[PDB]
Symmetry: C5
Subunit: 311 residues, 5 copies
């Protein structure tokens, strides 16, 4: 077996097509997602052409080893796909219709800048190295590109599974390579985040702000310090499900901002007490009365400023 | 090897049948379950038919490679099943009786809306792509569908393992596909949840409500704040064993409701103290006396409201 | 290759024998254990019989593919065993002596009712599906059943590795199956549990009971509440190493009982303070003086009651 | 292929030799370590002997399948080694020189009695089951036993990789087996343990002992109780990296001893307060003044007693 | 198949070349990184010479099994690489051009001394054992050494992927070995570390230092002790992502230094209170006033001293 000879000096076009059957295990920290899909391939091999009237049969079936099949690989994969050949059908003109069912862990980076309101574009790159005899070029057969209705990615909404029709043909190690981009657009389901993380956080922060309606230093310390323990607990819980980004994220910004609001609250609590011990509660109550309005107002404005900057 | 030619122009019926040997590893967060089972297949291949009189033997055994076997796959699987062919027996009329023993991690979504008092219907989808020569249609042989008595799924009660007799025949990538549904009904064992999680929770919440029989702000802060740490501990413990649902769960609802009861308790504790410092304990004791009855009554009613909305 | 023809109509007896080489990875939560062992098999195949005088050799060696070997499988396994054929020796009478070295993760349920003073009986089920030609029946060759002396299962004491000599012959999917039970009795090493978990727990509980020799509500709250945080820490630590049981466990019972002792201690602390504020320390000191004796006495008796009910 | 016939009735000696290339993943809890090494084997097969003059070549290379190779296995392995045959060279006298490169997870128990100042002797057991024709006996070729200089086991110092020259020849299932011991001596790098675990622990314990220079029960409770939370945190951190030992460990002993020092400190704090409330601070200050010296002195002596008993 | 005979008595030069396609999963604790790359190999096999006029092709293709291919292995790998042969092209002179696509988890040690401002040099060692017929020597073909632009290692900046052109030819087990070094230089992205870890637990440390503007022992204990709980939380979080180093790390040094600052702060708080109780607040306030300046100044200087010693 060797590649099919060219009629003129034109390159061999291979008609790709990925159809998602199962989409699962999107690891955010690892920036990986598992996929079980159908891989369709089609090319013209004139050596396999036959007369349908004399042969009697309209379509001829072949075993993978019997005929020449292009060596198609995935770029962004951890290991080589677990492929199972479904069918190889040859038309009278010599057009081969290959179909396999594969499974592979795909390495696709994620942008956590707008987390957990973020949307992602997952990539699946198909590639083919051109042989010495002739050059191989990939093509998208839009009829054979899609996903099944049941396909569910836990905690995400699957928008579209499209493919960049024009391949990126480039030189690599003195040989031509044709690369195709399969884009899977997904948007995060941010419902759960509000009653489970966002609201209980705010509640623990508001509990700290009750120290503005108290003159008891001992109780204020117990309030602001203990609520900070709850803050650390919640901060650790989030950053464990997120990778170390060289960029600032929307959550990371708020997370950091709350740490400042706790530090400044401690300073307030410390100042309030220092003045009361120094016998000037007129100054202490005026600062505390200001902080009653200041802390939520500045927090509300700073959040608007952040949400802007990020959205 | 090629498919058996049709008498007439009727499609090939393949008689399926799954018999569960082992059912284990139900990952709730991953929405997967592992299964070790028997897969029975039966079809008529007239090319394999023989006369039992001259042959001598009533049955004829074959190696998988020797005869045509339909390419049967599972839809909702992570990877291709680890199958081991047990037996291939051919009757004189040409009826093939295939039997294999497989193991596969099955991707079946779970509805956590009524967790941990929830029940689930696990699915196992059998599929076959129809060849060019003739169309392949799946069928359920109810005699060969079941589970062994020992089959145990830790923390669950196995109700029934049935199969939707009528296959879902549809078109996919210009070829017919016959899909069968194997339903495994299971209900959660919610015993452990009461003494381990539900009761100790309530106890830590009741401990926070002892602040209604105390006028000591320092002790009340220490009461309501520290019990909130215990609440956060138990909240994190539950939501780690559950995936991020776009829908509200029965547990999630109570979990959120307790966070409110803690926030309102802090407001009470703050108000009670503010009035005492402002020299009006008549107002403070009246609010505290009301909260002694209010907090459990509202909590008891709100739980009935939630349980009614979910069950 | 086909099964050996039966003299008269008797079933084929296959002489099994498992010899444990390595026993490791007992996952309590998963109810699984890994095993590396020897699997011996012996049957009479009269077609392989020879004369030792003319052949010169007393024993004839064969490759697995060359002769008929019975399809022996394990029932309670996650996946098919990783077997390596050690030796196949044939005697002049046609008696085949098969020996393989395998490794498989065995699914054996555990009874945590008496944890950590519990003992377990691990099972390894050998099975053989009877062919059309003749019925296959398993048998135990007690000479080839055992374990090596070095075999160590971390945190457990290996009592005995025996086998139920009489197989459980039953019908399944219109074919006979012969099932054998290999029992591995193990008892837990409960030393570590006393100084690491049992005693430090008791210490944190006794620390809470020092609130019976104190009239300071602020200090009593700090005592009983903070020690409850330590209790939650230790409770979480244990239930993470144990699966969700539909039955009550010995540990789970004590775990729950301590939660009650903490709740009742809070009620005492609350009552004591309420009476002191209400100006009646005669009633408060009398209740506290009673609780000094009551709490350890009731705890000691309730533990005897539990230990009696469980052992 | 069959074993080489004996000249006289002597057993076949196979010259073993393990050369470590990579040594990694020492799991303390699992009592396993991974190894990537060279396995050399040498035996005399007179059937393969040739004349170097007539043949023209002084050495003959063979494919594994072409010649008889002894079935060498590892005793203490999870699964069969991932071997790759490097070279098979035959000398004119029939001496075969086999060399393979393998990788296997080795099951070697560890003695945690002196942890983290403990040293371990890791074992790699080579075995061969004697065939019918003749008995196979293993031998150490010390020239082919070693490790590469780069070989690094994270957190350990590799002392020596030696082999017990005399094999342990024994009977098993009526056949002789020759077992060889390959010992890898390693000692723990206990540096990190001092500034990371040992010193911060002591610091949190000394912080608890500041309650001996205070008469404030409320502050003393806050001191001894909160520092106990830090103790529990640090105790859990260590015992998670260590398996459940039926024997007492050096760390476990100290860990338990500190729990007692916390319990006794609480009793002191409780007694001190009881006497002050009972109006006798002369008795309370005398006990507290004694405890200032008693606690560190008894702790320092008890540690010397333990270190002696263990080292 | 055997090695190609030498023209004169020169060794066989094999032209290596690694081209990284995917670089992922850098486990810091395990000191491993996964890589998906192209492995190019080129050697002259004069036996494979052909006349393109007679052959009909200028470049002849071969299956791996058909021709002699050098046994190239990786030194620092966990297991044998998952290789897939892309192309084998032979020119009329007999120059073989081998290309495979592999994936392997590479064992490369990391120096955590300057963590997280540390840079690393990852190694990939190619090796070939010389056969008895002739010696094999590796060579770098710099044209076929590189990485793709998309190659992303999460949390790291990929500097350069170079190769030490001169191989390390040495003797091992009486045979020559040619070893090549492939160096992948990477530097850590230390941005995330500042707002997520560095700043929040400078904030928790400063919160403890507010005890210098307070004379309330009860509040000071609650301050310094509770902030120490936050410190322990943050210490455990870091050392879990780092392996046990026999050397001191930059982070480990600061981590330890903060533990001292907490211990000394407790001593201050204890001394301050002892003098107040002993009726000498002039001495107590003077020490506290000094500590207000002392603690940040000493901390700032000690950090400069550490940063100088490490960088
Ligand atoms: C007038 C008081 C202003 C306080 C401003 C504090 C700025 C802290 C900046 C930290 C930057 C990193 C190191 C932080 C110490 C906390 C000091 C708290 C103030 C003490 C109360 C004084 C009452 C007069
Ligand atoms: C404390 C944290 C408070 C978080 C507040 C929401 C942040 C935000 O502003 O979130 C914004 C996102 C929507 O993003 P989008 O429309 O898809 O952006 C794409 C649009 N462009 C391309 C024009 C920029 O979510 C929401 O609709 C808000 C729902 C959450 C409300 C939580 C209430 C509490
Ligand atoms: C005389 C006091 C009896 C207290 C009995 C408490 C029974 C609790 C039953 C819980 C069942 C689940 C709900 C929590 C309420 C806590 C009340 C604590 C008592 C207040 C002190 C009154 C002092 C006169
Ligand atoms: C009579 C006072 C009612 C206070 C109601 C509190 C409203 C909180 C709204 C949260 C919305 C989400 C932000 C919450 C700050 C805590 C305020 C506590 C009240 C102080 C006591 C004053 C007594 C006169
Ligand atoms: C604080 C939280 C209190 C939770 C109380 C249980 C919620 C409930 O009422 O749960 C209800 C479920 C059962 O639901 P089902 O019959 O299977 O639903 C199908 C119903 N249809 C078909 C009519 C729609 O569990 C039980 O049997 C409750 C037993 C646990 C009691 C725990 C007491 C504390
Ligand atoms: C606080 C928790 C206190 C737990 C007390 C131990 C439970 C117990 O008494 O356990 C009892 C079991 C033994 O029972 P068995 O022989 O294994 O069962 C077979 C029984 N039949 C066949 C007669 C029914 O262990 C022991 O010998 C206890 C040793 C540990 C003592 C720890 C003291 C603290
Ligand atoms: C003047 C007070 C000096 C304190 C020196 C403390 C040295 C501690 C050495 C630790 C070595 C590791 C052991 C813990 C003891 C803590 C004692 C704290 C001092 C008590 C206040 C006395 C006020 C007069
Ligand atoms: C003079 C009092 C000596 C106290 C000895 C305590 C022995 C505890 C034995 C526990 C064995 C496990 C049960 C724990 C109770 C703690 C009691 C603390 C004493 C109360 C102070 C009395 C001051 C007169
Ligand atoms: C609180 C606990 C503090 C730690 C106590 C160290 C125990 C010890 O002294 O351990 C001793 C071991 C060495 O023992 P070895 O040489 O390996 O035993 C073999 C010896 N034979 C053959 C004679 C039996 O390490 C050390 O020198 C530990 C020094 C660290 C000091 C930590 C200061 C804090
Ligand atoms: C509390 C802990 C405070 C840690 C402070 C950072 C340590 C530091 O200043 O680290 C220094 C490293 C840079 O080192 P390098 O250039 O890569 O070394 C190679 C240089 N030679 C070849 C000359 C040896 O990071 C920085 O540029 C500091 C940026 C982080 C600022 C954080 C502020 C808070
Ligand atoms: C991860 C998620 C639950 C989360 C927590 C805290 C804050 C935010 C936003 C609102 C900034 C958030 O997205
Ligand atoms: C999921 C489970 C552990 C749980 C947590 C919280 C509340 C409930 C019910 C009782 C409302 C619950 O069952
Ligand atoms: C799980 C383990 C640490 C444990 C905790 C509590 C009680 C017990 C026995 C005595 C029932 C126990 O072994
Ligand atoms: C591990 C990392 C987040 C970290 C913790 C604490 C201190 C430092 C530097 C500032 C020394 C640090 O880099
Ligand atoms: Cl691929
Ligand atoms: Cl499948
Ligand atoms: Cl099996
Ligand atoms: Cl092995
Ligand atoms: Cl013996
Ligand atoms: Cl023998
Ligand atoms: Cl390799
Ligand atoms: Na082919
Ligand atoms: Na077939
Ligand atoms: Na066979
Ligand atoms: Na061989
Ligand atoms: Na080859
Ligand atoms: Na407190």
């Amino acid at each position: 077996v060797s590649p099919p000879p060219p009629i003129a000096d034109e390159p061999l076009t291979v008609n790709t097509g990925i159809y998602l059957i199962e989409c699962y295990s999107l690891d955010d920290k690892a920036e990986t997602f598992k996929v079980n899909a159908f891989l369709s391939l089609s090319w013209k091999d004139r050596r396999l052409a036959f007369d349908p009237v004399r042969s009697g049969v309209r379509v001829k079936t072949y075993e993978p080893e019997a005929i020449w099949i292009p060596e198609i690989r995935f770029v962004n994969v951890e290991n080589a796909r677990d492929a199972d050949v479904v069918d190889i059908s040859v038309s009278p003109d010599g057009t081969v219709q290959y179909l396999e069912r594969f499974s592979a862990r795909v390495l696709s980076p994620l942008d956590f800048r707008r987390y957990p309101f973020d949307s992602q574009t997952l990539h699946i790159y198909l590639i083919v190295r051109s042989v010495d005899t002739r050059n191989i070029v990939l093509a998208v057969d839009l009829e054979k590109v899609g996903k099944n209705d049941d396909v569910f990615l836990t905690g995400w909404d699957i928008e579209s599974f499209t493919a960049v029709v024009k391949p990126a043909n480039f030189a690599l190690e003195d040989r031509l390579e044709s690369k195709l981009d399969y884009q899977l657009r997904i948007s995060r389901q941010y419902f759960s985040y509000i009653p489970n993380i966002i609201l209980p956080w705010l509640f623990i922060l508001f509990i700290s702000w009750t120290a503005f309606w108290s003159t008891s230093y001992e109780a204020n310390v117990t309030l602001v310090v203990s609520t900070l323990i709850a803050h650390i607990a919640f901060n650790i819980l989030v950053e464990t499900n997120l990778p170390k980004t060289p960029y600032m994220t929307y959550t990371g910004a708020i997370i950091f901002m709350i740490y400042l609001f706790y530090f400044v609250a401690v300073i307030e609590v410390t100042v309030q007490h220092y003045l009361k011990v120094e016998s000037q509660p007129a100054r202490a109550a005026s600062i505390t009365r200001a902080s009653r309005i200041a802390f939520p107002v500045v927090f509300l404005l700073a959040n608007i400023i952040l949400a802007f900057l990020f959205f």
